[PDB]
């Protein structure tokens, strides 16, 4: 062959500008295989390069890239490669371009993430010809009929020309622009880039042809754009288009928080009868109806258990763990049966324990607010009088705002400290998010004293009430009385009051967060811990669980371990499978704080999901010698398996047997059961009708569902707290409503066996074992006499029809549809479920549904 | 597909090595 460049890199050292180009020819046909000479040249070839060139200064950058990427120096070939300009000819099957290619694709994401964040003139500049060469790559890509991951490439490179570009003029616009949201709602973190790639895909939904407003609303959600989703609805209601309304409406309420609500609902402010109703939609009065309803309907509640445990019950703890229980299984059911039916087992109540059993007849009273203050009238010390106040606040849910005048006057007339505590929690839950100056002041001055059940919840509910706010008067004020006070109570119920307040805010909490974790408080250290986990909410931020996980092993504090891990399990809520492999390491720790904040952990990011993994984990925790490491594990598992069937999860029988046992016991202890009794409570919450789930139908995150389950998980301080898991109790409801605003006979279809989503069976008493005589005796002619008496002598159903109210379990949603297409059409697939706006051609007399007493 | 694979292992990557890191620390206080 050749067997030597020698003498073509020598030709190069000429001073001829006709010997220097054939040389750099020759040298390029070759550099497939002297390399090894050429780069010791390569020098030459740089000087020449830098020059007027006549062709060489063209050919020599491309073969000075070619020799710098053989051998191995890519940080300088891209440089040359650069430089050669149109001689690197993009379209060609070489692994030299392809590998080139790739390099620079890498620099250009780079440089973009780089420079994005910097100021808006403050850019370094990037290199044209590298642009060039990024934008000929994106062309390409088009070209091979590949529209998908373009978008991928236009989002690592932070351009959104290009990927607005590929996204429209691509086929399949619906399915593009679906796998955009999902791109931008799941993986992408850059809170900022986010934004911006939703205002170009709402951008684009709306100059489609036939607008995707369902979607367009919940990005709008997503921005928090309350003057824009408003304009959405007012040109949808100056257009003949209802049932797009009523939808946007339903999901706008179950989506967006309080305040956005309240303000969109201003801008619409600023016939009738629709804009009235609107109002009406976004303020929640139908949504909350229909779910009391759907849940008083279908109210399959289970006494025998709870009877059960009642028979068991000896002390005070397992009392009002039965308390807690019957208020969970009769959450959102406005059915009191068992507390009017066991008046003396819940008048053997004392102090603390009757604020509890109030707080139970609220959480049972959940959503039913038309009744309300006079039904707490009817059912009736200070610390009555302050569980009534707090069960009328956990009836009068996140949407409260008419009761909040009340509440307010009557904290301000009350006189005894647990009056004055209840008070302010049923405040704080009432005015949840809303951030009203007045309420604040108000909770602001209760707190201002020295005593430690008062001050728990004015901070508590100062935490609530700013939730979100990121109130640097509400911080400074919160902190500064942590510091200066003198009482531990009051200590944790700021801390949980400033991790709400530092809510949803991903960055902007870093430096509070710093503050707390070096503080030497141990209780802020725990708030700082709390505040993490707030902010970082359902985000998976790693740098947030490198803090939490970085705390729950250097930190002294049990306590702070514990609630690092907690934060741990709520950061990760969002990906069930990814925290089993954080937790199960954590689960076999030493020391039983930490292993009881990975229980915990467990629990809230697996809460209504049933995974495999987690129960895995929690079965052996279940079976520990330390005492609340038990309950912690117990409570987890129904925390996980609220609402799962046997053949769902072949393991939730046996946990029910395991917690049946564990209440009928002679040692197990005190704590043990506590958690065993809550365990069935959240269990069979709700009657079997709700599921708790952080995040809505929709994926954006439930605010009340996230307070709910921290305030509860801070029940290991304060028992009255622990019926703040209310709030997480979400109806697992499919509800169809037609123009009227008003339930008709509908029967959705299920394609599936009855077996998987039903519900548990009653099981009956036990019966009565009478007395077995043993294995009556064999003697020596029994068997000879046994002799001489002989001589002497399925169909499995694979259909499901629901009613309109229709229990249908998460799970139980991608499969549901209706009977052969009948008069309803739903406006939206069978699958987010919630509440959908069932269309209708066919005109009849459409009867409709009962509004069923609410009693049970 | 394949971007959304990508993301998928770059975050798993990362996952990965703040879970090395945490149990590093928790064996030297272990061996503590």
Same mark, same amino acid.
């Given at each position: 062959?050749?067997?030597?460049?020698?003498?073509? !890199?020598?030709?190069?050292?000429?001073?001829? +500008?006709?010997?220097?180009?054939?040389?750099?020819?020759?040298?390029?046909?070759?550099?497939?295989? #002297?390399?090894?000479?050429?780069? /010791?040249?390569?020098?030459?070839?740089?000087?020449?390069?830098?020059?007027?060139?006549?062709?060489?200064?063209?050919?020599?950058?491309?073969?000075?890239?070619?020799?710098?990427?053989?051998?191995?120096?890519?940080? /300088?070939?891209?440089?040359?490669?650069?430089?050669?300009?149109?001689?690197?000819?993009?379209?060609?099957?070489?692994?030299?371009?392809? *590998?080139?290619?790739?390099?620079?694709?890498?620099?250009?994401?780079?440089?973009?993430?780089?420079?994005?964040?910097?100021?808006?003139?403050?850019?370094? +500049?990037?290199?044209?010809?590298?642009?060039?060469?990024?934008?000929? $790559?994106?062309?390409?890509?088009?070209?091979?009929?590949?529209?998908?991951?373009?978008?991928? !490439?236009?989002?690592?490179?932070?351009?959104?020309?290009?990927?607005?570009?590929?996204?429209?003029?691509?086929?399949?616009?619906?399915?593009?622009?679906?796998?955009?949201?999902?791109?931008?709602?799941?993986? &992408?973190?850059?809170?900022?880039?986010?934004?911006?790639?939703?205002?170009?895909?709402?951008?684009?939904?709306?100059?489609?042809?036939? +607008?995707?407003?369902?979607?367009?609303?919940?990005?709008?959600?997503?921005?928090?754009? +309350?003057?824009?989703?408003?304009?959405?609805?007012?040109?949808?209601?100056? /257009?003949?288009?209802?049932?797009?309304?009523?939808?946007?409406?339903?999901?706008?309420?179950?989506?967006?928080?309080?305040? #956005?609500?309240?303000?969109?609902?201003?801008?619409?402010?600023?016939?009738?009868?629709?804009?009235?109703?609107?109002?009406?939609?976004?303020?929640?009065?139908?949504?909350?109806?229909?779910?009391?309803?759907?849940?008083?309907?279908?109210?399959? *509640?289970?006494?025998? !258990?709870?009877?059960?445990?009642?028979?068991?019950?000896?002390?005070?703890?397992?009392?009002?763990?039965?308390?807690? =229980?019957?208020?969970?299984?009769?959450?959102?059911?406005?059915?009191?049966?068992?507390?009017?039916?066991?008046?003396?087992?819940?008048?053997?109540?004392?102090?603390? =324990?009757?604020? *509890?059993?109030?707080?139970?007849?609220?959480?049972?009273?959940?959503?039913?607010?038309?009744?309300?203050?006079?039904? &707490?009238?009817?059912?009736?010390?200070?610390?009555?009088?302050?569980?009534?106040?707090?069960?009328?606040?956990?009836?009068? %849910?996140?949407?409260?705002?008419?009761? !909040?005048?009340?509440?307010?006057?009557?904290?301000?007339?009350?006189?005894?400290?647990?009056?004055?505590?209840?008070?302010?929690?049923?405040?704080? @839950?009432?005015?949840?998010?809303?951030?009203?100056?007045?309420?604040?002041?108000?909770?602001?001055?209760?707190?201002?004293?020295?005593?430690?059940?008062?001050?728990?919840?004015?901070?508590?509910?100062?935490?609530?009430?700013?939730?979100?706010?990121?109130?640097?008067?509400?911080?400074?004020?919160?902190?500064?009385?942590?510091?200066?006070?003198?009482?531990?109570?009051?200590?944790?119920?700021?801390?949980?009051?400033?991790?709400?307040?530092?809510?949803?805010?991903?960055?902007?909490?870093?430096?509070?967060?710093?503050?707390?974790?070096?503080?030497?408080?141990?209780? @802020?250290?725990?708030?700082? $811990?709390?505040?993490?986990?707030?902010?970082?909410?359902?985000?998976?931020?790693?740098?947030?669980?490198?803090?939490?996980?970085?705390?729950?092993?250097?930190?002294?504090?049990?306590?702070?371990?514990?609630? %690092?891990?907690?934060?741990?399990?709520?950061?990760?809520?969002?990906?069930?499978?990814?925290?089993?492999?954080?937790?199960?390491?954590?689960?076999?720790?030493?020391?039983?704080?930490?292993?009881?904040?990975?229980? $915990?952990?467990?629990?809230?990011?697996?809460?209504?999901t049933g995974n495999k993994e987690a129960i895995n984990l929690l079965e052996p925790m279940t079976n520990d010698p330390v005492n609340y490491v038990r309950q912690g594990a117990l409570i987890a598992s129904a925390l996980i398996m609220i609402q799962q069937t046997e053949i769902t999860c072949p393991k939730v029988n046996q946990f029910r047997q395991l917690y049946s046992k564990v209440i009928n016991d002679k040692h197990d202890d005190? &704590?043990?059961?506590?958690?065993?009794?809550?365990?069935?409570?959240?269990?069979?919450?709700?009657?079997?009708?709700?599921?708790?789930?952080?995040?809505?139908?929709?994926?954006?995150?439930?605010?009340?569902?996230?307070?709910?389950?921290?305030?509860?998980?801070?029940?290991?301080?304060?028992?009255?707290?622990?019926?703040?898991?209310?709030?997480?109790?979400?109806?697992?409801?499919?509800?169809?409503?037609?123009?009227?605003?008003?339930?008709?006979?509908?029967?959705?279809?299920?394609?599936?066996?009855?077996?998987?989503?039903?519900?548990?069976?009653?099981?009956?008493?036990?019966?009565?074992?009478?007395?077995?005589?043993?294995? *009556?005796?064999?003697?020596?002619?029994?068997?000879?006499?046994?002799?001489?008496?002989?001589?002497?002598?399925?169909?499995?159903?694979?259909?499901?029809?629901?009613?309109?109210?229709?229990?249908? &379990?998460?799970?139980?949603?991608?499969?549901?549809? $209706?009977?052969?297409?009948?008069?309803?059409?739903?406006?939206?697939?069978?699958?987010?479920?919630?509440?959908?706006i069932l269309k209708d051609t066919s005109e009849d007399i459409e009867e409709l549904v009962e509004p069923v007493a609410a009693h049970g | 597909d394949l971007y959304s694979r990508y993301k998928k292992l770059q975050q798993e990557l990362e996952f990965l090595e703040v879970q090395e890191e945490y149990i590093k620390d928790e064996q030297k206080n272990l061996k503590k």
């Open positions: 062959m050749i067997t030597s460049a020698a003498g073509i !890199i020598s030709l190069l050292d000429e001073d001829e +500008p006709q010997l220097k180009e054939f040389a750099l020819h020759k040298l390029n046909a070759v550099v497939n295989d #002297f390399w090894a000479e050429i780069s /010791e040249s390569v020098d030459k070839i740089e000087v020449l390069y830098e020059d007027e060139g006549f062709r060489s200064r063209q050919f020599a950058a491309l073969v000075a890239s070619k020799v710098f990427y053989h051998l191995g120096a890519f940080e /300088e070939s891209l440089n040359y490669a650069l430089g050669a300009g149109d001689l690197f000819n993009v379209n060609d099957n070489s692994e030299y371009v392809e *590998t080139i290619i790739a390099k620079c694709i890498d620099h250009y994401t780079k440089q973009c993430v780089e420079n994005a964040d910097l100021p808006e003139g403050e850019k370094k +500049p990037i290199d044209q010809r590298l642009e060039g060469i990024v934008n000929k $790559m994106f062309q390409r890509c088009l070209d091979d009929h590949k529209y998908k991951q373009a978008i991928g !490439i236009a989002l690592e490179t932070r351009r959104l020309d290009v990927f607005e570009k590929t996204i429209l003029e691509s086929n399949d616009v619906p399915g593009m622009l679906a796998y955009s949201l999902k791109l931008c709602m799941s993986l &992408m973190q850059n809170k900022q880039f986010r934004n911006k790639v939703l205002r170009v895909l709402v951008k684009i939904y709306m100059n489609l042809e036939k +607008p995707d407003f369902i979607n367009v609303c919940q990005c709008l959600i997503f921005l928090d754009d +309350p003057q824009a989703v408003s304009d959405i609805l007012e040109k949808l209601v100056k /257009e003949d288009n209802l049932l797009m309304a009523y939808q946007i409406c339903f999901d706008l309420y179950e989506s967006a928080s309080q305040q #956005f609500l309240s303000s969109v609902i201003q801008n619409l402010r600023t016939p009738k009868d629709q804009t009235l109703k609107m109002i009406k939609i976004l303020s929640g009065e139908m949504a909350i109806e229909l779910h009391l309803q759907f849940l008083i309907r279908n109210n399959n *509640t289970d006494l025998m !258990i709870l009877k059960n445990t009642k028979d068991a019950v000896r002390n005070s703890v397992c009392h009002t763990a039965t308390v807690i =229980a019957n208020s969970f299984m009769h959450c959102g059911t406005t059915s009191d049966q068992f507390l009017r039916d066991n008046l003396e087992w819940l008048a053997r109540a004392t102090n603390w =324990a009757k604020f *509890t059993a109030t707080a139970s007849l609220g959480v049972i009273h959940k959503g039913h607010e038309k009744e309300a203050l006079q039904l &707490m009238a009817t059912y009736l010390s200070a610390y009555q009088e302050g569980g009534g106040l707090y069960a009328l606040g956990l009836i009068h %849910a996140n949407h409260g705002g008419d009761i !909040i005048d009340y509440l307010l006057n009557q904290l301000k007339n009350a006189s005894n400290d647990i009056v004055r505590h209840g008070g302010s929690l049923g405040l704080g @839950l009432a005015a949840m998010g809303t951030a009203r100056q007045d309420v604040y002041d108000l909770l602001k001055t209760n707190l201002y004293q020295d005593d430690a059940v008062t001050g728990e919840a004015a901070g508590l509910a100062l935490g609530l009430v700013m939730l979100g706010s990121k109130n640097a008067q509400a911080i400074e004020d919160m902190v500064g009385y942590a510091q200066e006070t003198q009482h531990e109570k009051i200590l944790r119920g700021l801390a949980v009051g400033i991790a709400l307040v530092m809510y949803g805010r991903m960055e902007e909490a870093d430096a509070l967060i710093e503050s707390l974790c070096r503080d030497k408080d141990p209780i @802020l250290r725990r708030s700082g $811990m709390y505040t993490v986990a707030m902010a970082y909410c359902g985000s998976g931020n790693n740098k947030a669980i490198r803090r939490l996980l970085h705390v729950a092993v250097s930190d002294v504090n049990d306590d702070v371990r514990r609630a %690092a891990v907690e934060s741990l399990g709520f950061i990760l809520f969002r990906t069930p499978e990814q925290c089993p492999s954080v937790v199960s390491l954590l689960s076999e720790s030493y020391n039983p704080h930490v292993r009881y904040g990975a229980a $915990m952990a467990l629990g809230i990011c697996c809460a209504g005190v &704590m043990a059961k506590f958690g065993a009794i809550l365990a069935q409570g959240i269990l069979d919450a709700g009657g079997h009708n709700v599921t708790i789930s952080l995040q809505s139908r929709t994926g954006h995150t439930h605010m009340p569902s996230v307070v709910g389950v921290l305030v509860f998980t801070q029940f290991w301080f304060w028992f009255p707290l622990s019926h703040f898991l209310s709030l997480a109790y979400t109806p697992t409801c499919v509800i169809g409503l037609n123009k009227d605003l008003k339930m008709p006979k509908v029967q959705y279809k299920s394609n599936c066996k009855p077996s998987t989503f039903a519900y548990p069976a009653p099981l009956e008493v036990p019966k009565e074992k009478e007395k077995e005589k043993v294995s *009556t005796a064999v003697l020596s002619i029994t068997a000879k006499a046994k002799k001489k008496e002989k001589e002497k002598e399925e169909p499995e159903p694979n259909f499901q029809l629901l009613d309109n109210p229709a229990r249908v &379990m998460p799970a139980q949603l991608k499969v549901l549809t $209706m009977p052969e297409t009948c008069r309803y059409q739903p406006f939206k697939p069978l699958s987010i479920g919630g509440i959908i | -």
